[PDB]
From a paper:
A key group of these are the respiratory chain supercomplexes (SCs); these which primarily consist of complexes I, III2 and IV (CI, CIII2 and CIV) in varying stoichiometries, which serve as the minimal functional units for NADH:O2 oxidoreduction. Here we report in situ structures of porcine respiratory SCs, determined directly through imaging porcine mitochondria by single-particle analysis combined with cryo-electron tomography (cryo-ET). Our structures, with an average resolution of approximately 2.5 Å and local resolution up to 1.8 Å in the best regions, enable in-depth study of [name] respiratory SCs in their native states. Our in situ structures also capture numerous reactive intermediates within these respiratory supercomplexes, shedding light on the dynamic processes of the ubiquinone/ubiquinol exchange mechanism in complex I and the Q-cycle in complex III.
CI orchestrates electron transfer from NADH to ubiquinone and concurrently translocates protons across the inner [name] membrane. The Q-binding site in CI features an unusually long, heterogeneous channel structure. The closed structure, characterized by a reduced angle and tight interactions between the transmembrane and hydrophilic arms, corresponds to the active resting state, whereas the open structure is indicative of the deactive resting state. Consistently, our study also identified two main classes of CI, namely the active and deactive states, characterized by the closed and open conformations.
Numbering used by the authors:
A (entry chain 1a): 1 to 70
B (entry chain 1B): 25 to 179
C (entry chain 1b): 1 to 83
D (entry chain 1H): 2 to 318
E (entry chain 1A): 1 to 115
F (entry chain 1K): 2 to 98
G (entry chain 1X): 1 to 114
H (entry chain 1e): 1 to 99
């Protein structure tokens, strides 16, 4: 009756679920839809400061497109 | 009501206690091998929610199974005192209950109760695997019927 | 002939892992000499630009280097594009 | 931000707790027993029952023990196992980490130190011997684990755990380094201290190894620590070889695939636990230094010249 | 400081577990419970006497080998250089050097438990 | 800077610790081993500060031989512990003459 | 032990190109092709002079030339830029690979419109 | 070297590290490439003792660039006196220097 | 700034951990934690590879020294930092030793002991340069097999001589 | 399968690297202006702060030479706010 095994997995599998999409959802929430930008090198990290500075609200995850320039 | 609250926390405590108590891997004589007979898949020790741990710092209920001797006596009391509270003791078989078949023997102490406090006396010689598996059940009922933090509240 | 064949028989019979580990370790050393793609691996790392190639002042007579990153002249990498 | 931390820590503890149920139940079904089913439906309430009873059990402080040493080790064991869950490339890693495996490897070596210190801190034979068998166990697996780790990701490009998803992509990494996964899987078995290589515990040989004077809560943190360790390093071998596809628009699609990959692999860890006798730590360092080390060099030499062999050097970024 | 926050939280969460597992669940010690365990009997009296190794030879070789692997950790970055030719020979040279040292120890006894 | 001061006085007490034997050689041998940790941290501090790419070499290569010095060190202590039994430097004087 | 010289606060102010990084790298391939002459002039100054204070004029030229570049694309097909740069934004690594369809729509404006 | 075997056969053994402005992996510059360059090619073929008094200025500036202690001391004087009078009053921060 | 100086302060009294002769692994406790925070010092300056290396091989190296202590260098009553009076005196003398100068550095920033260095923290000493797409530390280490060459040979050959040396000295005929 | 994918992963990386060096002239033209603006900003502040000191040349040559040097960032963020210090000086390394 190994189908009695599955309830152990069912909660356990759901238990392993939470840190998966949450780490994606909080990243989505804190960065406004777009995913968490990663900076493994100076170029990427030097970018985030420029995006934080240009936005004028001190957030790197808000981007101004072609409407910003006139 | 305070008594209602203490009763609820009381219900939480014993349920964990009686569900998750861990018998000692202790065996002496004829009773020990029948004790592991019920641990075999026929009666399934573990399906009642218990698992065998070895050291005194590990287990909950001492399961004394076999003839108690004068030479065995100092270690049994030492190993029993070494188990942290709460701790329970059940006495397998006629021999460990008291005296047994060798009650009159020079090298047998007449009763494990003469050395260690006992909760339940499971009889039979050897007790059938059914009988002692009830003895665990009776201890679950006995663990259920306590008022440890309840007597403290009214203390 | 006979000695080596029996020796290989003995090694494959007693400790197959060691006569194995000597094999993968054995040819991994001599394949580089026989490798035809090592030159491409050399060209792989050279092609990858990390520092941006600062332009050069043109006082005349450098036909090889272009005046714009669109003229055909200059080092190219269509071998990678094919690859 | 801290909401992400609790959602990373709290589910692991419940997952670890429910590991004890399946440990006692699939083993039993794999053993003609029925497993714990008397506490709630099918025993799913048993992991809870274990937790409170262990916590409400009397903590014990042996007279000959070093009190500060006796307490720091259980903290180290549980904390490292829990903090081991932050850097994995689970679709959106909590901390991107250039040296993902080095962070993985460094504190995995520090994890055995909690295993190491508890033996003498308990001040007896049955724990000192178990502590010293931990020395020989980590003498064996550590000298080679870095070699397997280097070999598999040398085709990845760098030490970043996130790039593993990109590297695997089309096909399973095990298809390219299957003898390495043969090396890696059972060496993780040799570090998690499971049945074939659980000499640090040693049920039959020395009562309980580095646990004999431990009781109640210190065990509860120790029991969760090594159960957290096996699941995490199994999740490590899940991404190392069996990494699934990841769609940026639907990150949850990775979670469902990744969870089963580390779950079916976990069932294996419970699978070997039933069928195999115990390695004597004599042959444990003997085997991992007689056949394991000379072999793992050969594929390490194989796996370094071979990116140069076919002009398949992976990019670092 | 994100790694600091999870590190601080992790060691904190561990400390609560030991904190309420030492005060909440009662306290009753009467010496022999507090005594060391010797499978039921009283120990010979020590746990501090020299527990001399029988595998001391392999322990130091681990230090040499665990040290030398740190020399080849830079391998993934060492592959992406303009000079993979001498990179191949030098990196290979290290692996044969460890192989020779293991082979040297293997032949002159060594790894087998010293008696 | 102040970080440099903290880790050169790490040498000083390590220097004091090494050439001050109280009971046994193992503690001093460990102090010799840990003495290079300041040496590692010392050398590492200038090299990332000064951005000299090649000389990142020596912190690892100092680690090759400093721990190799320890490797023969505690293996020497094995030879003492068989003839001498203990590892006491006070007893370690059989060449009194 | 001498004098330091710094250009005053007036001549170091330009009409700064204010657009996010993702948009810049989305059009970087086209930006680097034609808008290159001020760029190539700028760091021949940077590498020959080895002094940023001697290359402000080239910095003005590249800033304004990029502004004309952004003026051209905004005027001809502003909308096809929108989906291309926003999907670059969604990529944490700003990967070009998950952009081919959107890149295609961008590519055929400037090839045929301009 | 006591025996400059390096120069005899002409093959380098350890000279690649030596000085800071040697060739670097894909040309990663050092902190003081300019200052160290000026000092090194100042005192080349001139003699060790015939290098201190003449090629001095290129050296203390280079060892300045390495440690930057006198400038950090310069920043110490700026910061110390800054906290001296702003606590007393007078100076109020301009709105770009504190956000 | 805190962490940069604070971690180095832990590196100091951590070094007092083993320089004061406790029981040998209590000294092992002393330098394993400073090795842990020593990773932090180089970490804040970048140095991730080197910081993880010490947190890799020290633990590997320190793994066996415990065994030798408990197997062939331990006593009937193991030492501790409070039991013996001299080691406690050694412990404390390692506490006011740096306490005076850090107060001297925090209050005057011009401490002259042996070397002359200012005390404006250490955030200043960092750089403004850009690494591009390559980490300086991780590539200088990777230059082992491209430009090390001879520097590689002397290290590898000595490791061979190492396993010979650690064998013959302990062989005992 | 690995060789084909690894070659492709490389092909994207040079494509990514091509974009990076295409954006270098604009970014370098911005950083030098940002750095030079702020160095003057410190100098303008330094004019009013240095009045009590007996001997102080305002903006004297730091070194004996007149060639420009990369600015020791202590001069850059020396008198800025604490958060701006941690955001850039310790920003990268502490960032995740
Ligand atoms: C480095 C700093 C080391 C500081 C120190 O003295 O550590 C002693 C500490 C305890 O030694 P022990 O052999 O367990 O003996 C404890 C009692 O003396 C013997 O056991 P006990 O049961 O007497 O322990 C309680 C005792 C001693 O207090 C403690 O054990 C409490 C914890 C240590 C407090 C200091 O309490 C008191 O004396 C009164 C405290 C008020 O030794 C260590 O090696 C611990 C170092 C921990 C460093 C930080 C790690 C993170
Ligand atoms: C997570 C767990 C949540 C539930 C915890 C409930 C409390 C358990 C505490 C441990 C057992 C003691 C207890 O309940 O009360 C202490 C009380 C303490 O006061 P007491 O007087 O009842 O203690 C027992 C009697 N003497 C003191 C003589 C030993 O003890 C009991 O309730 C045991 C009877
Ligand atoms: C294309 C050309 C180049 C090819 C290069 C690659 C090499 C190809 C040829 C060899 C391929 C295989 C190499 C590795 C072989 C396995 C390791 C080895 O040394 O084996 C022999 C070794 C040695 O066998 P032994 O210990 O019995 O000793 C045999 C006798 N002597 C020593 C003389 C040789 O096997 C072991 O060490 C046993 C390990 C047991 C581990 C625990 C029990 C098993 C648990 C269940 C595992 C089930 C599978 C799980 C898979 C998970 C995957 C994620
Ligand atoms: C955090 C780390 C805590 C380590 C100590 C844990 C603990 O409570 O140990 C028991 C020890 C001792 O517990 P204790 O103080 O209850 O033991 C003695 C009790 N009397 C005094 C009544 C006899 O805790 C502290 O010393 C809000
Ligand atoms: C034997 C080691 C390998 C060959 C020598 C070598 O690495 O030379 C590198 C370089 C160049 O010599 P080379 O002979 O390797 O030249 C290049 C050859 N290909 C292109 C095939 C790689 O020489 C040195 O670094 C010499 C000094 C170090 C070695 C001293 C040995 C005594
Ligand atoms: C033990 C703690 C070890 C922490 C560690 O290894 O961090 C690696 C990592 C490696 O960082 P990194 O090399 O990935 O670069 C950091 C920037 N990102 C992540 C965007 C690429 O260290 C850090 O992230 C630095 C921040 C913490 C610095 C201080 C640590 C103090 C630890 C005290 C103990
Ligand atoms: C085949 C001929 C050599 C031979 O006999 O090899 C086996 C021999 C003994 O091996 P052993 O496991 O010790 O045998 C049992 C008793 N000890 O062992 C030896 O002869 C020495 C084997 C050394 C192996 C070194 C491997 C280094 C790495 C190789 C791949 C690169
Ligand atoms: S009671 Fe009977 S079965 Fe049990 S030990 Fe005694 S003789 Fe044996």
């Amino acid at each position: 009756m190994w189908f009695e095994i599955l309830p152990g997995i069912a909660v356990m599998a759901a238990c392993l679920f939470i840190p998966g999409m949450a780490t994606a959802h909080i990243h989505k929430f804190t960065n406004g839809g777009k995913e968490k930008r990663v900076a493994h090198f100076s170029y990427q990290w030097n970018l985030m400061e420029r995006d934080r500075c240009i936005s004028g609200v001190n957030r790197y995850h808000v981007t101004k497109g072609l409407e910003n320039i006139d | 009501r305070g008594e209602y609250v203490v009763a609820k926390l009381d219900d939480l405590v014993n349920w964990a206690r009686r569900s998750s108590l861990w018998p000692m891997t202790f065996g002496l004589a004829c009773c020990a091998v029948e004790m592991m007979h019920m641990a075999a898949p026929r009666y399934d020790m573990d399906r009642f929610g218990v698992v065998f741990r070895a050291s005194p710092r590990q287990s909950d209920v001492m399961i004394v199974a076999g003839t108690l001797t004068n030479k065995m006596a100092p270690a049994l009391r030492k190993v029993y005192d070494q188990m942290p509270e709460p701790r329970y003791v059940v006495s397998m078989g006629s021999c460990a209950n008291g005296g047994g078949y060798y009650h009159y023997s020079y090298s047998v102490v007449r009763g494990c109760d003469r050395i260690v406090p006992v909760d339940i006396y499971v009889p039979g010689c050897p007790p059938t695997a059914e009988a002692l598996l009830y003895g665990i059940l009776q201890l679950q009922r006995k663990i259920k019927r306590e008022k440890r933090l309840r007597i403290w509240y009214r203390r | 002939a006979g000695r080596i064949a029996s020796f290989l028989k003995n090694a494959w019979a007693k400790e197959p892992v060691l006569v194995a580990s000597f094999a993968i370790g054995g040819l991994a050393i001599i394949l580089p000499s026989l490798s035809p793609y090592t030159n491409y691996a050399i060209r792989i790392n050279r092609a990858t630009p990390y520092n941006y190639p600062v332009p050069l002042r043109d006082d005349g007579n450098m036909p090889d280097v272009p005046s714009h990153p669109q003229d055909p002249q200059g080092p190219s990498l269509e071998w990678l594009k094919n690859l | 931000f801290m909401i992400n931390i609790l959602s990373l820590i709290i589910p692991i503890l419940l997952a670890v707790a429910f590991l004890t149920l399946v440990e006692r139940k699939v083993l039993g079904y794999m053993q003609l027993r029925k497993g714990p089913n008397v506490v709630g439906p099918y025993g799913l309430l048993q992991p809870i029952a274990d937790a409170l009873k262990l916590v409400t059990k009397e903590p014990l402080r042996p007279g000959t023990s070093s009190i500060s040493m006796f307490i720091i080790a259980p903290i180290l064991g549980l904390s490292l196992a829990l903090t081991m869950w932050v850097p994995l490339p689970m679709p959106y890693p909590l901390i991107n980490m250039n040296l993902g495996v080095l962070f993985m490897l460094a504190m995995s070596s520090l994890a055995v130190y909690s295993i190491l210190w508890s033996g003498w801190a308990s001040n007896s034979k049955y724990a000192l011997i178990g502590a010293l068998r931990a020395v020989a166990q980590t003498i064996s697996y550590e000298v080679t684990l870095a070699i397997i780790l280097l070999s598999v990701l040398l085709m990845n490009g760098s030490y970043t755990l996130s790039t593993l998803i990109t590297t695997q992509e089309h096909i399973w990494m095990i298809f390219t380094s299957w003898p390495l996964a043969m090396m890696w899987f059972i060496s993780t078995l040799a570090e998690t201290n499971r049945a074939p290589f659980d000499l640090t515990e040693g049920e039959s040989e020395l009562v309980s190894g580095f646990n004999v004077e431990y009781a109640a809560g210190p065990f509860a943190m120790f029991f969760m620590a090594e159960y957290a360790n096996i699941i995490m390093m199994n999740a490590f071998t899940a991404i190392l070889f069996l990494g699934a596809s990841h769609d940026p628009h639907t990150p949850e699609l990775y979670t469902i695939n990744f969870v089963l990959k580390t779950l079916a692999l976990t069932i294996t860890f419970l699978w070997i636990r039933a069928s195999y006798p115990r390695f004597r730590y004599d042959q444990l360092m003997h085997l991992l230094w007689k056949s394991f080390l000379p072999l793992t060099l050969a594929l390490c030499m194989w796996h370094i010249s071979l990116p140069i062999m076919t002009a398949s050097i992976p990019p670092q970024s | 400081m994100n790694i600091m926050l999870t590190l601080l939280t992790n060691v904190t969460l561990a400390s609560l577990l030991v904190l309420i597992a030492f005060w909440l669940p009662q306290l009753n010690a009467y010496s022999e419970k507090t005594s060391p365990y010797e499978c039921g009997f009283d120990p010979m009296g020590s746990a501090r006497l020299p527990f001399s190794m029988k595998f001391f030879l392999v322990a130091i070789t681990f230090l040499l080998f665990d040290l030398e692997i740190a020399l080849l950790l830079p391998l993934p970055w060492a592959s992406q250089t303009n000079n993979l030719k001498t990179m191949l020979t030098m990196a290979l040279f290290l692996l044969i050097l460890l192989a020779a040292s293991l082979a040297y120890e293997w032949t002159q006894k060594g790894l087998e438990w010293a008696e | 800077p102040l970080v440099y001061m903290n880790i050169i006085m790490a040498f000083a007490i390590a220097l004091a610790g090494l050439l001050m034997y109280r009971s046994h050689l193992m503690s001093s041998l460990l102090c010799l081993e840990g003495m290079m940790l300041s040496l590692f941290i010392m050398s590492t501090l200038i090299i990332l500060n000064t951005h000299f790419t090649l000389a990142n070499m020596m912190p690892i290569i100092l680690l090759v031989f400093a721990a190799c010095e320890a490797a023969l060190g505690l293996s020497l202590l094995v030879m003492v512990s068989n003839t001498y039994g203990t590892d006491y430097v006070q007893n370690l004087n059989l060449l009194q003459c | 032990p001498g004098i330091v010289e710094l250009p005053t606060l007036e001549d170091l102010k330009v009409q700064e190109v204010k657009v996010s990084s993702s948009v810049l790298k989305a059009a970087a391939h086209h930006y680097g092709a034609q808008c290159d002459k001020p760029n190539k002039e700028f760091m021949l100054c940077r590498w020959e002079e080895k002094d940023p204070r001697r290359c402000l004029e080239e910095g003005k030229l590249v800033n304004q030339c990029a502004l004309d570049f952004f003026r051209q694309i905004k005027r001809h097909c502003a909308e096809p830029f929108t989906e291309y740069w926003t999907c670059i934004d969604y990529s944490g690594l700003q990967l070009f690979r998950h952009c081919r369809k959107q890149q295609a729509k961008f590519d055929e404006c400037v090839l045929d419109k301009l | 070297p006591f025996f400059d075997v390096q120069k005899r056969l002409g093959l380098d053994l350890d000279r690649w590290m030596t000085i800071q402005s040697a060739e670097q992996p894909h040309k990663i510059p050092g902190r003081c490439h300019a200052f160290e360059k000026e000092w090194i090619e100042c005192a080349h073929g001139i003699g060790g003792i015939r290098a201190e008094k003449e090629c001095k200025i290129e050296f203390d500036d280079f060892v300045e660039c390495l440690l930057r202690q006198k400038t950090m001391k310069r920043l110490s004087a700026i910061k110390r006196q800054r906290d001296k009078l702003i606590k007393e009053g007078k100076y109020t921060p301009p709105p770009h220097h504190l956000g | 700034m805190y962490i940069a100086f604070i971690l180095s302060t832990i590196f100091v009294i951590g070094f007092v951990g083993f320089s004061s002769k406790p029981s040998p692994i209590y000294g092992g406790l002393g330098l394993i934690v400073s090795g842990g925070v020593g990773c932090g010092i180089v970490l804040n300056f970048g140095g991730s590879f080197l910081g993880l290396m010490v947190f890799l091989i020290y633990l590997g190296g320190m793994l066996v020294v415990f065994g030798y202590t408990t197997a062939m260098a331990t006593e009937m009553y193991p030492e501790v930092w409070v039991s013996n009076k001299t080691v406690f005196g050694a412990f404390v003398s390692g506490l006011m030793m740096e306490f005076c100068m850090v107060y001297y550095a925090l209050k005057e920033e011009e401490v002259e002991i042996i070397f002359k260095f200012n005390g404006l923290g250490d955030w200043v000493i960092y750089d403004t340069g850009d690494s591009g797409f390559f980490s300086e530390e991780a590539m200088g280490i990777a230059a082992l097999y491209s430009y090390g060459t001879w520097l590689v040979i002397v290290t590898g050959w000595s490791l061979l001589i190492g396993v010979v040396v650690i064998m013959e000295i302990t062989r005992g005929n | 399968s690995m060789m084909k994918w690894n070659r492709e992963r490389r092909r994207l990386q040079i494509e990514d690297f091509e974009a990076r060096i295409a954006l270098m002239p604009l970014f370098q033209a911005e950083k030098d202006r940002r750095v030079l603006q702020m160095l003057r900003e410190n100098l303008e502040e330094e004019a009013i702060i240095m009045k009590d000191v007996p001997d102080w040349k305002v903006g004297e040559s730091v070194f004996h030479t007149t060639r420009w040097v990369t600015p020791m960032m202590g001069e850059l963020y020396g008198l800025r706010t604490n958060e701006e210090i941690l955001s850039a000086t310790y920003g990268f390394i502490w960032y995740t």
